[PDB]
Write a protein that binds this ligand. Structure first.
Ligand SMILES: CS(=O)(=O)Oc1ccc2cncc(NC(=O)Cc3cccc(Cl)c3)c2c1
Ligand SMILES: CS(=O)(=O)Oc1ccc2cncc(NC(=O)Cc3cccc(Cl)c3)c2c1
Ligand SMILES: [Cl-]
Lengths: 296, 305
C-alpha cells in the first residue's frame, strides 16, 4: 500500500555528473564514454565557439581534472571530447520524450548531485522543476531494465518559475531559445490520461468514493474536458489504460464519467491519495510499475 | 525557483542493497563493511509471526541457512547475531562500495529518503517523514522488507530507518539500524494499530516560509498570536503542539523573510479557519507537512523573491 511520487534510483546517473567551467560560468556536464555533454550557453554560438580552445574548458570529475582534447556543437548542446573514458558509463540511450511522459531529474550544482525528483514534461513543454542558479546541465532520465534513457538537459528558468531544456541531442522541448530574451510558457493544460491513471491507482489502493454507475462517450468527455483546460483524450489513451481497466473492473469511459463529475462538482472536502487536486504527473506505466514492484 | 519533494541521490545506498533468503522468505539486507543488516523476521514462518520466540528460532539456525546475494554473487555468511529487531549477518567479504556512514535514530517530524527494494534490487526512491504517531506513509509492496531510509548531508550517509511491516491502515512501521522500533510496535502479527495521526506544525510553518521565499504572500495577515493561543487553536485541527524549540528552529527563516514566527503562526491559524478559497500554496491545495525547516533552507534560495 501507499502511493508516492517515485523517482528512479539515480546511482547510474550520479557516476556521470561532472563540473564544466568556461571563463566565469560554471554548470553541470554529463560524462559518457570520452564525451562530456553540457548546455552550449556555457560559452552567434559558432562565432563564440571558434574563438575557444580546448584548454579554455575546465572539466572536473570529483577531485580529478579531465583534459579536453576536442569540442563540437550539436544544436544547443556542447560536446567536449575528453582524454579519459568514464569507467562508470552505464548502458544508455538518448531518447526524446513527448508531453505527458514522466522522468526523474538528478539536480546538480558544481558537478555534485544534490537531489532527485520525479516530474512530467507539461503539454506546454515546460517542466515544473526545482532548480537554483548552478543547476544548468542537470539531466532527466528513465531506466528500463539496466539501460538509462537520457531525455532532458536543463538549460533555463522562465519568468513564471517553470523550467525549459533540451533532449541530449540539443533540441529544445517547446518554442524556446537559449538566450536572454522575452520568453514565456504557453497556457498549460492538464494531462488527462495521467489523471485517469492516478484515479485507477486510487481505486487499487482502496479509494472508490468517486466511482459512480455512469459511463460516457469519448466525444462527450472531450467536449467537457476542453472546458476545464484538460488535454483531449484519444483512442490511444483509452487503449493504453486497458490493463488498469481490466484489473479494477472500471471501463475507461466509466472512469471518465467519474472525472467529469469531479471536474463539474469538485472533491467536496474529500481527498484522493492524500491530494485535494487531481494529480497528472503519473503515467499509466508509472501506476502499473509502482503497483507491481519493477526493479533496476 | 520551484519547490519539489526532493529525495537524496540514492547511489551510495544502491551499492549496499543485497537479497537475504532464509528458507522460503526472501527480503532486502543492507551490506556495510563485512555485515549484512536485515529484519529478524526473515527467520520466521507466517505461522510464527503470531507469537515468535526469536531467540528460540535463531538458536536453531546455522550460518549456511542464510543465503545472501549481492548482484549475481553469493556472499558467504560466517557469523550471525541479533540486536533488538535486526539480524546482523557477518559475511566473508567487505562491501567495496561501503560509503562513509552513521546510524542515527530520528524523531517524529524528521524527513528522509527511502530506497524501495525487492529481491535486493532497488526500484525507486521517494521522500517521506516520520509521522508524529511513529508510522511512515510509504509506498511498499510484499518483498520490500529491509528497504532503508536515509539522509545524505555532505558525503556521509545517515541510515535512520529499516522497513519491517505494513499496518492495517496501509501505513508502515520499522526500526532504526540498531533494531529499535519507532513507535509502540512489535515485529509480531498482533492487533496493533497506529495511533491517531497529527499534522507536523513546525514543518507546515517552514513550508509557509518557503512559499514566502518563492514570492507568495496571499495568506499572511496583520495579526500576531501568543504561543499558547496558537496551540489552543492548532490542537482543535489535530496539529502537533508547537514548542519553544520549534520557534527557535524557525529563527533563521523568520530573519530571512522578515516575518516573526508568531506572525506566521497567525497566518496558519487563519488558513485553518478559512481554507484556501480556490487558491494553492506552492502548487498544493493542502497544507504540506513533510518539509522540515532544514529541508526548506537546503532547497530554497538564500534571497527572498
Ligand atoms: C535569475 S537568478 O536568480 O539570478 O539565477 C537563476 C535562478 C534559478 C535558475 C533555475 N534554472 C536555471 C537558471 N538559469 C538560467 O535561466 C540562465 C539562462 C539565462 C538565459 C538563457 C539561458 Cl538558456 C539560461 C536559473 C538562474
Ligand atoms: C502479505 S500482504 O499484506 O498481502 O502484502 C504486503 C503488502 C505491503 C507490505 C508492505 N511492507 C511490508 C509488508 N510485509 C509485512 O508486513 C510482513 C510482516 C508481517 C507481520 C509482521 C511483520 Cl514484522 C512483517 C507488506 C506486505
Ligand atoms: Cl531527528
Amino acid at each position: 500500500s501507499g502511493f508516492r511520487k517515485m523517482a528512479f534510483p539515480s546511482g547510474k546517473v550520479e557516476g556521470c555528473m561532472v563540473q564544466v567551467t568556461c571563463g566565469t560560468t560554471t554548470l553541470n556536464g554529463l560524462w559518457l564514454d570520452d564525451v562530456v555533454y553540457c548546455p552550449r550557453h556555457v560559452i552567434n554560438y559558432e562565432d563564440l565557439l571558434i574563438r575557444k580552445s580546448n584548454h579554455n574548458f575546465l572539466v572536473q570529475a570529483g577531485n580529478v581534472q579531465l583534459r579536453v582534447i576536442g569540442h563540437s556543437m550539436q544544436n544547443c548542446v556542447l560536446k567536449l571530447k575528453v582524454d579519459t573514458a568514464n569507467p562508470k558509463t552505464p548502458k544508455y540511450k538518448f531518447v526524446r520524450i513527448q508531453p505527458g511522459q514522466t522522468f526523474s531529474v538528478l539536480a546538480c550544482y558544481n558537478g555534485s548531485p544534490s537531489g532527485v525528483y520525479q516530474c512530467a514534461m507539461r503539454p506546454n513543454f515546460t517542466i515544473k522543476g526545482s532548480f537554483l542558479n548552478g543547476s544548468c546541465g542537470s539531466v532527466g532520465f528513465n531506466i528500463d531494465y539496466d539501460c538509462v534513457s537520457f531525455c532532458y538537459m536543463h538549460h533555463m528558468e522562465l519568468p513564471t518559475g517553470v523550467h525549459a531544456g533540451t533532449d541530449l541531442e540539443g533540441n529544445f522541448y517547446g518554442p524556446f531559445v537559449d538566450r536572454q530574451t522575452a520568453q514565456a510558457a504557453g497556457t498549460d493544460t492538464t494531462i488527462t490520461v495521467n489523471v485517469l491513471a492516478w484515479l485507477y491507482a486510487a481505486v487499487i489502493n482502496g479509494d472508490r468514493w468517486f466511482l459512480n454507475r455512469f459511463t460516457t462517450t469519448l466525444n462527450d468527455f472531450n467536449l467537457v474536458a476542453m472546458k476545464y483546460n484538460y488535454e483531449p483524450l484519444t483512442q490511444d489513451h483509452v487503449d493504453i489504460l486497458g490493463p488498469l481497466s481490466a484489473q479494477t473492473g472500471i471501463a475507461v469511459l466509466d472512469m471518465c464519467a467519474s472525472l467529469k463529475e469531479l471536474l463539474q462538482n469538485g472533491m467536496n472536502g474529500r481527498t484522493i491519495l492524500g491530494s485535494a487536486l487531481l494529480e497528472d504527473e503519473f503515467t499509466p506505466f508509472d501506476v502499473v510499475r509502482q503497483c507491481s514492484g519493477v526493479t533496476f
